[PDB]
Design a protein around this motif. Structure first.
Motif, short mmCIF file in Angstrom:
data_model
loop_
_atom_site.label_atom_id
_atom_site.label_comp_id
_atom_site.label_asym_id
_atom_site.label_seq_id
_atom_site.Cartn_x
_atom_site.Cartn_y
_atom_site.Cartn_z
N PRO C 33 19.05 -3.68 -6.10
CA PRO C 33 17.62 -3.62 -5.75
C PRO C 33 16.84 -2.61 -6.58
CG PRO C 33 18.98 -3.51 -3.77
CD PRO C 33 19.92 -3.40 -4.94
N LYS C 34 15.60 -2.96 -6.89
CA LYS C 34 14.70 -2.07 -7.62
C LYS C 34 13.40 -1.92 -6.87
CE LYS C 34 14.17 -5.94 -11.04
NZ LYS C 34 15.51 -6.64 -10.95
N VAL C 35 12.67 -0.87 -7.21
CA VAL C 35 11.28 -0.73 -6.79
C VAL C 35 10.46 -1.26 -7.95
CG1 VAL C 35 9.41 0.85 -6.14
CG2 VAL C 35 11.75 1.23 -5.28
N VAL C 36 9.82 -2.40 -7.72
CA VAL C 36 9.08 -3.10 -8.76
C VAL C 36 7.62 -2.73 -8.61
CG1 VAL C 36 8.63 -5.31 -9.87
CG2 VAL C 36 10.76 -5.00 -8.63
N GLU C 37 7.04 -2.17 -9.67
CA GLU C 37 5.70 -1.59 -9.62
C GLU C 37 4.66 -2.49 -10.25
OE1 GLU C 37 7.36 1.77 -11.67
OE2 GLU C 37 6.91 3.11 -10.00
N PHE C 38 3.56 -2.69 -9.52
CA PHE C 38 2.43 -3.49 -9.97
C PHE C 38 1.15 -2.67 -9.77
CE2 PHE C 38 4.59 -7.54 -10.51
CZ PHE C 38 5.65 -7.49 -9.59
N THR C 39 0.16 -2.91 -10.61
CA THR C 39 -1.16 -2.31 -10.43
C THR C 39 -2.20 -3.40 -10.59
OG1 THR C 39 -0.43 -0.17 -11.35
CG2 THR C 39 -2.77 -0.52 -11.17
N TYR C 77 11.87 -3.80 -3.54
CA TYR C 77 10.65 -3.25 -2.96
C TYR C 77 9.52 -3.57 -3.92
CZ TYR C 77 13.96 -0.81 0.01
OH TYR C 77 15.02 -0.54 0.87
N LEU C 78 8.43 -4.11 -3.39
CA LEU C 78 7.24 -4.32 -4.19
C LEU C 78 6.34 -3.14 -3.90
CD1 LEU C 78 5.14 -7.66 -4.45
CD2 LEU C 78 4.10 -5.37 -4.52
N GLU C 79 5.95 -2.42 -4.95
CA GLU C 79 5.11 -1.24 -4.81
C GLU C 79 3.82 -1.47 -5.58
OE1 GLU C 79 6.96 2.76 -4.23
OE2 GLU C 79 5.87 3.26 -6.09
N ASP C 95 -3.33 -7.86 2.14
CA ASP C 95 -2.37 -8.35 3.11
C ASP C 95 -1.38 -9.25 2.37
OD1 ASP C 95 -4.50 -8.76 6.10
OD2 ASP C 95 -3.24 -7.13 5.44
N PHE C 96 -0.10 -8.90 2.41
CA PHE C 96 0.96 -9.73 1.84
C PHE C 96 1.63 -10.50 2.96
CE2 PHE C 96 1.47 -8.27 -2.51
CZ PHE C 96 0.98 -6.97 -2.53
N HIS C 97 1.61 -11.84 2.89
CA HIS C 97 2.31 -12.66 3.87
C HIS C 97 3.81 -12.43 3.80
CE1 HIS C 97 -0.99 -15.93 4.65
NE2 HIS C 97 -1.37 -14.71 4.98
N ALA C 98 4.27 -11.93 2.65
CA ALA C 98 5.70 -11.63 2.44
C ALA C 98 6.19 -10.38 3.17
CB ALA C 98 5.97 -11.49 0.94
N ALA C 99 5.25 -9.54 3.59
CA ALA C 99 5.55 -8.20 4.09
C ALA C 99 5.59 -8.20 5.61
CB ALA C 99 4.49 -7.22 3.59
N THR C 100 6.14 -7.14 6.18
CA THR C 100 6.24 -6.99 7.63
C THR C 100 5.61 -5.69 8.09
OG1 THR C 100 8.29 -8.25 7.54
CG2 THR C 100 7.87 -7.01 9.58
N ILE C 118 -1.48 3.21 -2.62
CA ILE C 118 -0.19 2.67 -3.05
C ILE C 118 0.60 2.23 -1.84
CG2 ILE C 118 1.92 2.97 -4.40
CD1 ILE C 118 0.57 5.15 -5.99
N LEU C 119 1.01 0.96 -1.87
CA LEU C 119 1.73 0.35 -0.76
C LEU C 119 3.08 -0.10 -1.25
CD1 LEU C 119 1.60 -0.87 2.19
CD2 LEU C 119 0.81 -2.99 1.05
N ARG C 120 4.12 0.20 -0.49
CA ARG C 120 5.45 -0.30 -0.79
C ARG C 120 5.97 -1.10 0.39
NH1 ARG C 120 9.44 4.13 -0.46
NH2 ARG C 120 9.77 3.24 1.63
N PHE C 121 6.43 -2.32 0.14
CA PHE C 121 7.12 -3.07 1.18
C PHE C 121 8.40 -3.70 0.65
CE2 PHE C 121 4.57 -6.46 -0.69
CZ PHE C 121 5.43 -7.55 -0.66
N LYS C 122 9.36 -3.89 1.56
CA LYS C 122 10.63 -4.52 1.22
C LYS C 122 10.46 -6.05 1.29
CE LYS C 122 15.48 -3.79 2.43
NZ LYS C 122 16.24 -3.21 3.58
#
Ligand SMILES: [Cu+2]
Ligand SMILES: [Cu+2]
Ligand SMILES: [Cu+2]
Ligand SMILES: [Cu+]
Ligand SMILES: [Cu+]
Ligand SMILES: [Cu+]
Lengths: 337, 336, 336
Positions: C33-39, C77-79, C95-100, C118-122
């Protein structure tokens, strides 16, 4: 297969029948692949779509709305002779959702009045599929003028459920559902037009509302009722193929169910079971298999009940047989409290 | 079962509970087939459906919109006593999509004001199913006046996933979604009528546009929000049964998912999993199973967001428990 | 995983690209697993949506409608760093439908102009999922102003069919379908406005009719045609991700099929096969996999043909390669 191999295949000429009936066919394929030949003449005709006498300038494959169901088996070739008689005014074509390439065949079948064409395609995938006219720049207008139908590509081994077991229907019906967009005058009465062309601009305006004035089976409000009601008997296994070339529908057999429903219409996708109401997206055909258990009158509807009962999307079954009180009984009939 | 076998089955009376709540039941069936007995009285009454005092002449099974959820197991019989008090003005009946024959029961249950009827049917197929009133020639009018509900026919061994592992919920809610078609005068103000029949012609005109004026849960805008939000706790397993007797819907738990969704409402059809938004066609019920992982407020909506947030199709869940930073964290809070 | 464990995971910065293209990624997950970073920067801008010069005040993630596709793998993790520049006028969030949790992230990401977060979700569930802005009390307005996109959470072992066979695409395209509600004057001419707030009241009136004036791919009529037609070759396997954050759609590849269609968008729900037309409810994304067999022009449409050909929901594929006469041939070309 090579041109030579296809040329060596048996040919079978089929006589189409008007919906909701389906031409004679065998559920399990008789022999190896064949080139199955159909002919349809396109008729631009005035049709009446309700008991009030409301008219549509229909564009009708084989003179009917919907066009007739063509039945082949997987890996047969469907070879259609399509004729646009000189009495018509518009160019027409045919797009088979079952087919691969040239927009479904539309790119190769554009025929002016006075012309004909023959299109052959390999029916590679089993299921029920929409076909419809789609002249570039004029696509929804032809479709919502009734110029659509469906085909069935049976598996070579006939129908089966999701889990290997053979399903054999006793009879099959094809219900084509049509959304119509009929212009109204200032007092809200439906307009009449001399030529199909006169109706175009007014009809497009109504189409743009995305609100049909009529949603009908077999071309008219109440078309499949009275002496035209569909028929079955207790114990009879019926396949109901339903198509909608432009707009969503939600079929429901009132008093029954869909025991097996290929809601997507594709036989390699396992059917849903014990269905109350299934869903067929616009641009698709679906099929439901049911064994009748109770006699009496059923209504087969699009279960947006406004669409069914106000706009026309209701057919009837008349079912013979013995009533089953185990399944349902009136313990106390309507009576004073 | 033979005649004597059917007659010998235990009869059990069950007391109903207004939606979104559900009456007492066991997930796993206890003993063999039973004749489960329910009674509903039909109420015709004016209800207010929004914050502007908009009225509908509701036609309500058991006095509620939607009608209550009735729960039985596969191969039980459901035996409904349906009562139409003499104070009502319309004939009513009931069609159960779960039942087989006589249009679902409607042919056998036409009751004028001052009449009652008792219908029994065998619940042969497991699932959630719509029921609704359907008097011949006035079907959609009764239905879009709120005269619809659902039942659940549980498998005798309770719910299972696609691998036959048991799924046991801690609680169950029933969300009945209603499309209403309220007439407006030429200034856009919703009209009021003295009697239900007086509204018939004007309402059918609105119905024919296929555009509801309101789309609501539990009979009114905001009925399942605020102090009436549904509740759960982190770790709790919840079944949400959702019905729509006349019109498509696309439920979505905002902040959550449908871990298992029987989108067609039928338990012999394997559930979809990990769902963001599911689809229930008009004339059907569906059911979604979720285990809550995060505390906080959730919204539960028809995910046409205009229908949800302009027309009224939005509920809330209030969920207790501990936040899980693994699942979600604010790395940098909103800041300049 | 603990905060310490997450802090130790490899980071990867991803550079987003404009739809319908998708940023570089691996189908089979590269290591643990990685923390994948987007801006993404939010841009409020006028977009022109038809050849009549019709304007929409778009609210655009990363400056585009739809917002770009983000691709991660399950249990990454999407960050996301989300920026709302001072050049904007409205508060926005995501709002990410993928997130909880926290309504999918919207509760934690409300940023005024001049703010970032900055938001991080699994990404716990594999599939394609919608994301969209959803400011409390203004939700559908932001979504139908084009403030929506999608993500794909791939299984760590890539895509498979329902029965364990690997499915590897050669190309991927993201088609974001948008319903717009443009006000018109007394003559039926579309209205123009000089600020987003100016258009609000008139736009809400149109939204409430539930009838879009336009239904488009990639923000405009004809957007994915000509210079922007999607491309392929005979033999090539293509994945088409399709989202609609607010309204139902029924995609169809004219001349082709959906060989495998994750109609719900969720990869643990087995794909439907041999599809002519599939169905994606409003508030969801779906994905179709297809191997091209014939060269030529294909139209990819919402198969309500009024929506496709009158309202704008039509794209093209230009496909190179050899024509297959076994699959289809003109036995007799159009002739007298
Ligand atoms: Cu088509
Ligand atoms: Cu019904
Ligand atoms: Cu959402
Ligand atoms: Cu035509
Ligand atoms: Cu009623
Ligand atoms: Cu926003």
């Amino acid at each position: 297969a090579t041109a030579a191999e296809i040329a060596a295949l048996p040919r079978q000429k089929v006589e189409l029948v008007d919906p909701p009936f389906v031409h004679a066919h065998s559920q399990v394929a008789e022999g190896g692949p064949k080139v199955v030949e159909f002919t349809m003449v396109i008729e631009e005709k005035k049709i009446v779509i309700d008991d009030a006498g409301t008219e549509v300038h229909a564009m009708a494959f084989n003179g009917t709305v919907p066009g007739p169901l063509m039945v082949v088996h997987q890996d047969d070739y469907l070879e259609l002779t399509l004729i646009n008689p000189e009495t018509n005014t518009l160019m027409h074509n045919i797009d088979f959702h079952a087919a691969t390439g040239a927009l479904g065949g539309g790119g190769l079948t554009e025929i002016n009045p006075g012309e004909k064409t023959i299109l052959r395609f390999k029916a590679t995938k089993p299921g029920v599929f929409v076909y419809h006219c789609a002249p570039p720049g004029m696509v929804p207008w032809h479709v919502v003028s009734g110029m659509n139908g469906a085909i069935m590509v049976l598996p070579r081994e006939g129908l089966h459920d999701g889990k290997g077991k053979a399903l054999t229907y006793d009879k099959i019906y094809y219900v084509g559902e049509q959304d119509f967009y009929v212009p109204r005058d200032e007092n809200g009465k439906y307009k009449k037009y001399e030529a199909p062309g006169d109706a175009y601009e007014d009809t497009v305006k109504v189409m743009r509302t995305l609100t049909p004035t009529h949603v009908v089976f077999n071309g008219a409000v109440g078309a499949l009722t009275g002496d035209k009601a569909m028929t079955a008997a207790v114990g009879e296994k019926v396949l109901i193929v339903h198509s909608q070339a432009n707009r969503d529908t939600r079929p429901h057999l009132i008093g029954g169910h869909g025991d097996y429903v290929w809601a997507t219409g594709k036989f390699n996708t396992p059917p849903d079971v014990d269905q109350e109401t299934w869903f067929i997206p616009g641009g698709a055909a679906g099929a439901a298999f049911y064994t009748f258990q109770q006699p009496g009158i059923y209504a087969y509807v699009n279960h947006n009940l406004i669409e069914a009962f106000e706009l026309g999307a209701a057919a009837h079954f008349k079912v013979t047989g013995e009533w089953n009180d185990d399944l349902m009984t009136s313990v106390l009939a309507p009576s004073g409290t």
